Design a protein around this nucleic acid. Structure first.
Lengths: 445, 185, 200, 246, 134
RNA sequence: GAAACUGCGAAUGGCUCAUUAAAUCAGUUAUCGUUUAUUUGAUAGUUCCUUACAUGGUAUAACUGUGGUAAUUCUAGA
């Protein structure tokens, strides 16, 4: 229970964790009268003059002395490129908060001026930034976290096309901050790199997805990298207020293919499933429908391989996600189910069938319930009793309005001698509940 | 429970208020300088009485006493800035020999009449209080303004007025609108 | 396609020109040139040609004019911005054409071309006053007759190369365009003795 | 009255605050604290009437509750805290330290102060005593109790105190020929070397002081405050260095 | 003929309340009394802050006219504006809302009545309701 | 976040000069003759010592309900 009903006073306390949990990153979600984009004699010089007025600290005053003698114009910046940057990096490594605000703003704007020539300072700029952020962990300051990650967002935004072309080196740089063992570091770094992921086109995106799945199998033992990748991709898809967009459906297609390859890790398939879970909980069905089309399309493309259990994993996630309120057509889902069954020609099958029995539509179950229980009776033969106990625990009255007793009797007639102890355990469970009197009523071989 | 602002009486009736010589004196002063009040003449005579009393006491004190030097130099420079005491008379004896005609000549309506923005002293008074005359940038409409020397060079008509500047007054432009409509009919 | 990249491109061409001029001078330096082109902005004298001048051979040329009693001259010289990088002059048909504007007691304003430092000032265009611009009220604030009617006395050319403004004993102050010498605006001084003596 | 007063009229206030006599009836009664009532500067007077960093008492509350003001190393949030004489008031966002010290005209004086000088603070050892469990301490002129002093520290002797540890760095004896600041009385703000302590018994010991233009005056031992040796003030004096002129 | 000319003096960067405080001299010849809305727009354009950050108050036209001297404040963000401004000035500039309350006498009289009621009141209300119901 | 318990404040402020002629008061002293909420700075390992400290016990308010009375910032029983 976070602070929900605001009070009448004006100055709340707002502890540090509350401020971080309130904090987000996107300055394009934000907006104001941006001074550096507003006045244009030189971006660095405009921001420098505003901060010379605003800030009165010893460290920024010394920096102001040096570089105020150096820069007054754009060829002066373009010539003394190295001196300015090394002085900036010197004071950021001096690590003083009162001066840490304007130097971060100036680093962003200095890159904006020095655009496609910044790519030689860019690496150790990022290094000093992440060292600053770990120092900020040591001295808790939501201000410092907000400034530093806004500087990273600005650098990504200003050098979009080049880092997009070279995406795998950027995440190779940010993995010490993406897989960091703090929830907010992984959250913010994932949001920034998520903006770049949204900006990237399809081919470099495919390369990046393949590389990051390989890196996740490398960090099999790590779970916080998994969580960081999850929050990264889900924000790249969800980025708007209620509607994921066309870049999100393209991202979903790329992730679907490169996860349904026979080389991708099943942990990465679980990551794809959790991404789909977050998206299904977030977005509405009108904005969701083309993503559903893409998913059904890619299922029909690659349904026939050694990836059938993998398809089953993603499909169980789909049918579970929230309810039928996000699912367009259980008829198409039924076609997929029969396709997967005919291709299979176990436990996940029982889970899928139980989730379909509980969550799907009765108007489709009226014509699929025969084939469903026949698929269960054929394929998951030993598992059918476990499936039936799970179904009765999830929703008993649905199968009871349907034909649970008859299919149970047919299963008993077909097979009783292999798992009679399992039969006894099932009946031993179903005695105590007063809601299974038809199961108390059923007949025997 | 506030602190009291201080007020002060600016004039003072003389000892014998009815005396033929002083009545004709004030008639001469009022008609010559365009005044309106024994109140105004007593205002100036009270200021001059205070000044000459201070100067007399600084005379009676010892020469090169620091009290005399300090207060006498301050009094002399204030009078010189007013313009009543000239440059070459920078002494407490001439401060003793000043008079009401000097002060009423440093007033503003006398300066406007003397510089020639007005035909008479009463015309000068009317101009000032109709807000036509500025001293530098500031519109003054007080006929007892006591200019200094630099200000005395700076007196001129005001940029708001119809006389040294913008659009004519309501009488002129109403007459012009009337003549325009009468030529239209 | 981005304005920051356009500024960077103009600055890079400027730096190419600086390195080439440093090489031709050689047949430190670039840093000093940049510090100079900024150091115009600080208020200290820096331009130090006090002894490089050769006055003993300074070539002189009188040019006699037609009207009588030139009163003032102001010459417009186009320079280059350092913040943006286009030029000082407005049009593209000028490209740094040194102009001069002269005003004369004959109520005549005249623009000469002086772009060449060997030939004489060539009279490009002119505009003359006269007595048809005398105000009909003569006693009012309105003095906005489009010409000059008595004794123009000072000229000044705007640095953007669009306007040149002239003022004289007629207590007006007229801003003329720089091409057709057409009077775009006329501001009375609104004073009976407000004669305009010198502009800057 | 049947108890302690809580209000101060405007004209009742100490004169050296330079409080103008029309902006109200009450002046910030300085809360009980280290310094006495008639020689203390509340933080509202300092921040508003002197630095002009605030326009209202509500802005002084905003500053202090934002926790910017530190008085002798520690954060204060009471707007009428009695910041007295020889004080260190650091504003961090403005990067300034202020030694509060008197001027020649008898008023308090902002003194801009660097970090290495703000790190310490003088204090006039005024009561040396033996406390419980047999430990000795000194009581300086701002209530600061410092256990375990040097054995040579006596009454009326200056002690330079390290602030961030509350400890005694060193001390300056009271002999003739030291540099003496005068704090109360007619001559307050006149820095002069002490010539002779005229000492009476049961009365008040007067002190004959002679300053750099070799002018001589007399004050009391209560108003005398030792700064340092001849020509070596331990603190940085304000402009004019405490010399009364004509 | 007319061009409002704004100049600022005594620009004190006050980083404690995150603002810049100055003194605005307005010259408006052949005109009167430029609006605080217009001054806030123009000061926002000058100082590159937002109009919601800029605040001005206390203007005074001189005798004769043509000049009015005042005061201004420019916060470093609209967030700092909403944090440090007074509520009456936020009401002026339209940021906050003018809350609706009863007059001083009405509030004090309701205070005195509720001061005379002890407890919540509802058991007493049931008691006197059935009492008058007898 | 109402109510009520708890803590603090209500001893300041505002008004008036009735009384009082070494009394109040003004200037000057003393407390080596006493109390002091608050503010500020310091301050308290006591290890053991014969038969729960991962933390003892009672109540009462507000509240639910039953009432009295012409009536009050009245209150009773449970």
């Amino acid at each position: 229970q976070r602070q929900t009903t605001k009070s009448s006073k004006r100055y709340r306390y707002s502890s540090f964790k509350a401020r971080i949990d309130d904090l987000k990153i996107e300055p394009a979600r934000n907006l104001e009268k941006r001074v550096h984009d507003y006045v244009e004699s030189s971006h660095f010089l405009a921001s420098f003059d505003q901060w010379k007025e605003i800030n009165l600290s010893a460290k920024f005053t010394e920096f102001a002395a040096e570089i105020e003698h150096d820069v007054q114009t754009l060829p002066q910046i373009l010539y003394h490129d190295k001196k300015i940057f090394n002085s900036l990096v010197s004071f950021i490594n001096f690590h003083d908060e009162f001066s840490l605000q304007p130097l971060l703003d100036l680093l962003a704007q200095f890159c904006h001026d020095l655009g496609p020539d910044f790519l030689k300072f860019y690496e150790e700029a990022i290094k000093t930034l992440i060292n600053l952020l770990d120092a900020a962990i040591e001295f808790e300051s939501s201000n410092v976290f907000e400034w530093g990650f806004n500087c990273l967002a600005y650098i990504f935004k200003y050098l979009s096309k080049f880092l997009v072309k070279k995406l795998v080196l950027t995440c190779d740089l940010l993995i010490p901050l993406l897989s960091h063992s703090k929830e907010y570091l992984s959250r913010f770094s994932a949001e920034a790199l998520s903006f770049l992921v949204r900006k990237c086109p399809v081919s470099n995106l495919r390369e990046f997805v393949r590389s990051v799945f390989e890196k996740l199998e490398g960090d099999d033992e790590q779970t916080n990298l998994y969580e960081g990748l999850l929050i990264l991709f889900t924000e790249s898809m969800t980025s708007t207020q209620e509607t994921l967009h066309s870049k999100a459906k393209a991202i979903m297609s790329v992730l679907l293919h490169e996860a349904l390859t026979k080389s991708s890790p099943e942990r990465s398939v679980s990551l794809l499933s959790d991404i789909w879970m977050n998206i299904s909980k977030y977005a509405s069905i009108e904005s969701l429908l083309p993503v559903y089309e893409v998913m059904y399309q890619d299922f029909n493309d690659s349904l026939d391989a050694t990836n059938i259990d993998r398809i089953l994993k993603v499909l169980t996630t789909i049918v579970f996600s929230e309810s039928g309120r996000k699912i367009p057509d259980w008829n198409k889902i039924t076609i997929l189910i029969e396709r997967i069954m005919s291709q299979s020609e176990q436990d996940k099958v029982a889970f899928l069938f139980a989730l379909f029995i509980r969550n799907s539509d009765v108007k489709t179950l009226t014509l699929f319930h025969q084939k469903l229980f026949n698929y269960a009776l054929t394929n998951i033969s030993d598992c059918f009793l476990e499936f039936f106990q799970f179904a009765l625990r999830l929703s008993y009255e649905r199968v009871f309005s349907f034909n649970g007793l008859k299919f149970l009797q047919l299963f008993l007639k077909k097979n009783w001698q292999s798992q009679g102890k399992k039969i006894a355990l099932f009946f031993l469970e179903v005695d105590d509940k007063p809601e299974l009197q038809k199961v108390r009523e059923v007949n025997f071989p | 429970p506030r602190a009291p602002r201080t007020y002060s009486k600016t004039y003072s009736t003389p000892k014998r208020p009815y005396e033929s010589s002083r009545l004709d004196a004030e008639l001469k002063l009022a008609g010559e300088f365009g005044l309106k009040n024994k109140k105004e003449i007593y205002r100036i005579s009270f200021q001059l009485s205070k000044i000459r009393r201070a100067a007399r006491d600084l005379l009676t004190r010892d020469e090169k006493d620091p009290k005399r030097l300090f207060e006498g130099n301050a009094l002399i420079r204030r009078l010189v800035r007013v313009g009543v005491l000239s440059e070459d008379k920078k002494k407490l004896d001439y401060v003793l020999a000043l008079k009401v005609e000097d002060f009423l000549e440093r007033r503003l309506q006398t300066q406007v009449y003397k510089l020639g923005l007005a035909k008479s002293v009463h015309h000068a008074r009317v101009l000032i209080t109709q807000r036509h005359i500025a001293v530098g940038k500031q519109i003054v409409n007080i006929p007892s303004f006591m200019v200094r020397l630099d200000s005395e060079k700076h007196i001129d008509f005001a940029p708001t007025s119809p006389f040294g500047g913008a659009r004519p007054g309501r009488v002129a432009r109403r007459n012009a609108a009337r003549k325009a409509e009468a030529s239209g009919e | 396609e981005n304005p920051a990249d356009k500024r960077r491109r103009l600055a890079k061409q400027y730096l190419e020109n600086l390195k080439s001029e440093a090489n031709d001078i050689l047949t430190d330096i670039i840093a000093s040139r940049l510090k100079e082109d900024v150091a115009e902005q600080q208020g200290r004298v820096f331009r130090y040609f006090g002894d490089k001048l050769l006055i003993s051979e300074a070539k002189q040329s009188f040019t006699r004019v037609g009207e009588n009693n030139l009163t003032c001259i102001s010459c417009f010289q186009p320079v280059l911005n350092k913040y943006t990088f286009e030029e000082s002059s407005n049009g593209d048909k000028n490209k740094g054409r040194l102009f001069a504007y002269t005003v004369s007691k004959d109520l005549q304003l005249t623009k000469y071309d002086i772009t060449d430092f060997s030939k004489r000032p060539k009279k490009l265009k002119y505009a003359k006053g006269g007595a048809k611009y005398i105000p009909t009220s003569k006693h009012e604030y309105e003095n906005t007759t489009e010409g000059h009617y008595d004794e123009i006395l000072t000229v000044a050319a705007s640095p953007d190369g669009k306007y040149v403004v002239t003022g004289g004993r007629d207590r007006k102050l007229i801003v003329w365009s720089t091409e057709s010498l057409s009077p775009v605006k006329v501001i009375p001084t609104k004073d009976r003795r407000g004669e305009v003596l010198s502009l800057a | 009255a049947r108890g302690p007063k809580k209000h101060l009229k405007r004209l009742a206030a100490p004169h050296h605050w330079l409080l103008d006599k029309l902006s109200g009836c009450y002046a910030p009664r300085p809360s009980a604290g280290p310094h006495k009532l008639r020689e203390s500067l509340p933080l509202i007077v300092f921040l508003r009437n002197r630095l002009k960093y605030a326009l209202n008492g509500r802005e002084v509350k905003a500053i202090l509750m934002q926790r910017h003001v530190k008085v002798d190393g520690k954060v204060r949030t009471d707007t009428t805290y009695p910041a007295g004489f020889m004080d260190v008031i650091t504003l961090d966002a403005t990067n300034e330290n202020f030694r509060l010290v008197y001027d020649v005209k008898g008023r308090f004086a902002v003194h801009r102060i660097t970090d290495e000088e703000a790190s310490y603070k003088l204090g006039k050892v005024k009561k040396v005593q033996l406390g419980k469990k047999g430990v000795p301490y000194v009581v300086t002129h701002d209530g600061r109790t410092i256990r375990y002093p040097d054995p040579n520290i006596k009454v009326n002797d200056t002690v330079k105190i390290d602030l961030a540890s509350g400890k005694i760095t060193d001390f300056i004896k009271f002999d003739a020929g030291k540099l003496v600041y005068v704090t109360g009385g007619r001559n307050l703000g006149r820095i002069g070397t002490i010539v002779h302590k005229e000492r009476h018994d049961g009365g008040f010991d007067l002190v004959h002081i002679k300053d750099s233009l070799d002018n001589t005056f007399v004050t009391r031992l209560n108003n005398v405050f030792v700064i340092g040796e001849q020509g070596k003030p331990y603190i940085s004096l304000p402009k004019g260095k405490g010399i009364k002129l004509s | 003929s007319d061009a409002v000319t704004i100049r600022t003096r005594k620009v004190i960067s006050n980083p404690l309340l995150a603002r810049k405080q100055f003194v605005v001299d307005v010259l408006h010849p052949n005109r009167a009394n430029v609006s605080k809305d217009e001054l806030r727009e123009k000061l926002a354009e000058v100082y590159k802050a937002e109009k919601d950050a800029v605040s001005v108050f206390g203007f005074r036209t001189q005798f004769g006219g043509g000049k009015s001297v005042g005061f201004g404040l420019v916060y470093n963000s609209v967030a700092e504006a909403k944090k440090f401004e007074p509520t009456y000035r936020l009401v002026r500039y339209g940021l906050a809302e003018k809350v609706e309350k009863a007059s001083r006498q009405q509030r004090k009289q309701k205070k005195n009545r509720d001061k005379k009621i002890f407890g919540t009141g509802k058991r007493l209300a049931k008691k006197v309701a059935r009492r008058n119901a007898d």
